[PDB]
C-alpha cells in the first residue's frame, strides 16, 4: 500500500508470526500464496494448495500460487468445505490470514451450488434450490430471451425453467457477472435414461500417480464435472482421456484439431480401451465408417461449425448427431477453444460433461478467462519440475544461444522497416553457421534432431543448402507421413526440418535435439508445444536468435512461460570448435551474394 | 588488499618487531599457503640453515611454480633469511625471534597474552553472547547509516574525518554533511568482514598521522582475533594510545565495554573474524530474503526492484533496468555476484554452484551493456603524402607513448590531445630539416 | 580467397561479445583455481559441444 | 588535421552509426571520418545524442520485465 521503495508492503497487515517458521506458507491481502519447497511438509502443502488454487510459478525453491474465484469454485466442488479450507489455510500461514482473504473466500464459496444447469430429453434447464434467486435473475434483460415461449414457471416438484439451447453461452457469461456461477455436474452413476455402453479399459494400462491425482479430482463425490487437465505432450495425456471415458461409461465424443489427431485418438482407444471397431467411428469425411449408431465418435473442429453448405452424407451425420445427448464430450488442444467458430461448436452439440485436455494453456488476447465459463475451471496443473525429477519426463537442457548480425546484413536490417526485415535476421550467416555446426555435432553422436523454422521461404534455402529432408507443409499427405516414418528407424538420416507443421499434437517420434530458428512473434504456446515434442540430461533443445534485432525481445518475451514452468535458459555466446571444421558461408563472397537473393523477394 | 600485501610493504624492522608477539606469529603463519606451512613446521626445530637445493628437492618438478611462489612469499615476509653457508653455498634458516615466539605460542612458555582475569573476580554487569552480537550488529548498522547520511546515526567527528580520508565521502562544503562517492557505494556493497578489514587497513595506513605505534596496534588486533568469544580480558597492561585505539573499537562494535574507565572488555564475533545466509535466488530472477533490518533491504534494493515486504520476508525481482541503474551508480557485477554468494541461503549451498549459472551470466551480460561504446579523445592525422614520412611520425608518436590507434594500411593514426603539440612540432621540425 | 577466410573469421568470431570477454580474460586468470569442484560444476552445466 | 573522439565498438554498432550518418537521424553528417571496420571518428560536441540513440536501440529490443 506504501511506496517507499515502490513495493506493495503489507508488514502491518499480517503480524501473526507466533512460533516460528514451521509453516512454509505466506499469504497476501489482495491474494497470493508463497510456498517453501524445502520443507518436510512440502507434499501435503502442495496437495492442499493444488485443490484450492492454481499455480502461477513453480521454480526450484519458492512456489507461487494465486487465489481466484474459479479456483475456490473448484475447491468447493470437491468435498472440501469452507471451514476446512479456512482452518487449514490459517493452520499453515506463519503470518496470519489478512482480513481481506477470509471475506473473499466466504463470498466465493457461499454461492456455488445455488444454481445448476442440467440436460434432460435434449432440453436445457436451470434448477435452483433457493427459489428467490430465480426472481433475482428474472429482472436481467439478457436472460429473458433464453426462455421460449417465456417458460411460465416450469412448475416441477425447487424452481426451474427452460433456456434456449443456442444461447447457453450468453447466460453462462452473465451468471458469473451476477455472482451466481453455474455448475455442470453429471451423476453418471444413476441415469437410467442413457444407453450406457460396454466400454472397459484393459487391466494392463497402468497409470502414473500424477494422473491418479487428476482423475481422482475429476470424480470427487461420485460425479463428473467439466474441467481442464493440463499435462505435457510427452507425458500421458490421451491415457487420462481414455480412462475418463471408460469410467463415465457413456456415449463419448472426441474432438481434435487436425485430421490426423482423430487417428491418434482411435489408436489410443484401440490400445487402452478394448472396444470393437464397429462402435468406434471417425467423422472426418475420409473413410465414413458408418458414424450413425456408434458408441464413441471421434471428429475434429472446423467441420462441426461449418458456415457453408455441408456434404449430404455429412449433413445427415450432423443431423443424427445433434439429436441425442453425449457423455463426457472430450476436447483436445483446448487452448484454442475461444475462437470465432470453435466456441459455437460447444453450443451446436449437447453434452453433459465437457472435459478439455491441453499441454500449453498459455494464449494471447487474454481469452483464456473465457474458457473458465465456456467449459469449466482449471482442474489440474501438472508440476513439470517434479514430473521430470521422477525420470518419466526427459530432463531437457534448454538453451538460448544468439549469434551476432553480420555487417553485410545489419545495414539492410536497419535500412528497411516495412516488414521486410523478417527474412534478414532469419537468414543470418552466423546463425546459419551455428545451426550447421550443431547439426553436424549432434549427428556425429547419433542424436535425433528436429529443426523447427517458420517462414518457409527461408526454410527452402536453409534445407536445400544442407541437402536434408524438409516439410514445406502443403507438400502432400503421403510424403510427410513416409518422411516422418523413415525418420526414426534409419541411421542414415536422422534430421528433418519442419515449417510450423509440428506446432500441434502429432505422432512425431522421440527426438533429443530441437533447434528452432525464426519462430512466430511472441507465441508462448508455440514454444511450449515445440519443447513438448522433445520430452517423452537425456535431451536438450536450442533456440537461435539474432542479436540487436526484434528476435531478442521476441525470445525474451516468449520464454516467460517456461521459466514459470521452472526451466532456465542458459545463454551461449561462443561455440567450441567453430573454426575447427569447415562450415558454409566461410568467406565474404557468398555472404554478400546472399544479400541479392534475400532482397530478391520484393513482394510488392 | 590482503594482510600479506600490507605486511610485505613494511620495513624489515617493523616485521622483526611484529614477530616479538606470539599472537602475531600465529596470525602470520595461518595466512601462509599450505606448502609454506609444512616448510615452517619442518624447520621449526632446526638450528642450522638448509641448502636451497635441498629444500627445492622436497617438491616435485611439476609443482615447482607453487614452490617458487611460496619461497618468494616467505622471503618477502622475512620469515626466513638466506645465510652464507661455508663453501660458497646458501643456507636458509627461519628468523630466530619469529621461530622462538611461534614455539612459545604452540609449545608454551612466557606469560599469557592477557594479564589476568580472576584478579577482579566475576563481572558485575556481564552480558551474553547474543547480547554482544546484537550490540555489534547495532553498532555496524549505525556506522553504515552514518555512511548514508541519515540523521538517526550520530558518531564522533574523528570517525567522519577517517571516512573522508578513506575517500568514501567528501566534505565539499564545510559544516554540511559529506557526500558519499562511488567508492563509498562500492564499499557499502562489500561484505561485512571485508568492510572491517578495509577500514582497519585504512586506519593503519594513516596510523602514523596520529603518532600511534603500528606494531602495538597490530599485535593487539591479532591478540583480539584469537580471543575466545564470551570471555573478558584485562584492559590494564597497555599503553595509553592503544587504549585510545580501543575506544575507537568500542565505537565500531568490535569490542564491548560498559564504561571507558572499566577494566574489562568483551571481544565480539566481528573481532574474531577481523584477521581473516538468508537470500534465496530463483531461476526467474527473484530474490527471497529472510531479513528484517533496513540495512539489508536497502542493499538489496540498490540492485533490484522490490515487490513485497512481509514482516520476516522480502520478495524482490532482479531486472535489467535495476542492474543497469546499480552499475551506473558505480557497483560492478562481480561485487553483486559476490554479495549474493556470501548471503546465499543454506538451502542453495547444495547446488553446485550455489548460484544458478544463468542468473550470473545474465548479470554479467547486463554489465557489459554499459561499456559497449569506447570513447577516446584525440587528434586524427590523415594528410600523409608518403609512407616513409608516415612511418617516421608514427615511430616518434610511439616513442612519446601518445598513440591511441594506428592504421598503416591507410596511413591513419590518432594521438592524445596532450601529445598533439609534440607531434606537431616534430612534424614541422622534420620539414624544416628537409 | 585465402585472405577472405581470415577476414570473415576475424569479423564474425569476435564481433560483439568477444572484444570485451577476451580483454577480461587477458586481464584476469592470475590466481590459481580455488577448488576442483568448480571445474566439476562447469562440466555439469556445460553443453556437450563445449566439452571437446 | 582533425580533432574529435575515436569510438571503438562492434561492426554492428559501427554500421548502425554509419546508417545514422546517411539517414540524417541527428540533423547533420557529424560522422566525419571512418578509419577502421570497427572504429569511427566522430565530433565530440554531440556524443550525448549518440549515446541516447544507442540506448534507445538497445532497450527497444529488450522487453524489460518491469
Swiss-Prot record, chain A:
Enzyme Commission designation: 5.6.2.4
Residue stretches making up the Helicase ATP-binding domain: 218-379
Annotated consequence of substituting residue 48 to S: In XP-B; combined with features of Cockayne syndrome; mild; reduced interaction with GTF2H4/p52 leads to low ATPase stimulation and decreased DNA duplex unwinding by TFIIH; does not alter helicase activity; does not alter TFIIH recruitment to DNA damage; XPA is not recruited to DNA damage by TFIIH; nearly wild-type transcription activity by TFIIH
Superkingdom field: Eukaryota
Residues that, per the record, bind ATP: 231-238, 533, 536
Family: Belongs to the helicase family. RAD25/XPB subfamily.
Protein name: General transcription and DNA repair factor IIH helicase/translocase subunit XPB
Organism this protein belongs to: Homo sapiens (Human)
Gene that encodes it: ERCC3
UniProtKB/Swiss-Prot annotation, chain B:
Annotated GO CC locations: core TFIIH complex portion of holo TFIIH complex; nuclear speck; nucleoplasm; nucleus; transcription factor TFIID complex; transcription factor TFIIH core complex; transcription factor TFIIH holo complex
Coiled coil region boundaries: none
Domain of life: Eukaryota
UniProt keywords, alphabetically: DNA damage, DNA repair, Nucleus, Transcription, Transcription regulation
PANTHER family per record: GENERAL TRANSCRIPTION FACTOR IIH SUBUNIT 4, TFIIH, POLYPEPTIDE 4
Function: Component of the general transcription and DNA repair factor IIH (TFIIH) core complex, which is involved in general and transcription-coupled nucleotide excision repair (NER) of damaged DNA and, when complexed to CAK, in RNA transcription by RNA polymerase II. In NER, TFIIH acts by opening DNA around the lesion to allow the excision of the damaged oligonucleotide and its replacement by a new DNA fragment. In transcription, TFIIH has an essential role in transcription initiation.
Protein's UniProt name: General transcription factor IIH subunit 4
The species this protein was found in: Homo sapiens (Human)
Organism placement in taxonomy: Eukaryota, Metazoa, Chordata, Craniata, Vertebrata
Swiss-Prot record, chain D:
Keyword rRNA-binding belongs to the record: no
Matches recorded under Pfam families: Tfb5 (PF06331)
Record's GO cellular component terms: cytoplasm; nucleolus; nucleoplasm; transcription factor TFIID complex; transcription factor TFIIH core complex; transcription factor TFIIH holo complex
Chief localisation class: nucleus
Keywords noted in UniProt: Cytoplasm, Disease variant, DNA damage, DNA repair, Ichthyosis, Nucleus, Phosphoprotein, Transcription, Transcription regulation
Top-level taxon of the source organism: Eukaryota
Signal peptide: none
Localisation: Nucleus; Cytoplasm
GO terms of biological process kind: cellular response to gamma radiation; maturation of SSU-rRNA from tricistronic rRNA transcript (SSU-rRNA, 5.8S rRNA, LSU-rRNA); nucleotide-excision repair; nucleotide-excision repair, preincision complex assembly; transcription by RNA polymerase II; transcription elongation by RNA polymerase I; transcription initiation at RNA polymerase II promoter
Claim: DNA damage is one of the keywords in the record: yes
Function noted in UniProt: Component of the general transcription and DNA repair factor IIH (TFIIH) core complex, which is involved in general and transcription-coupled nucleotide excision repair (NER) of damaged DNA and, when complexed to CAK, in RNA transcription by RNA polymerase II. In NER, TFIIH acts by opening DNA around the lesion to allow the excision of the damaged oligonucleotide and its replacement by a new DNA fragment. In transcription, TFIIH has an essential role in transcription initiation.
UniProt similarity note: Belongs to the TFB5 family.
Subunit structure: Component of the 7-subunit TFIIH core complex composed of XPB/ERCC3, XPD/ERCC2, GTF2H1, GTF2H2, GTF2H3, GTF2H4 and GTF2H5, which is active in NER. The core complex associates with the 3-subunit CDK-activating kinase (CAK) module composed of CCNH/cyclin H, CDK7 and MNAT1 to form the 10-subunit holoenzyme (holo-TFIIH) active in transcription.
Protein name: General transcription factor IIH subunit 5
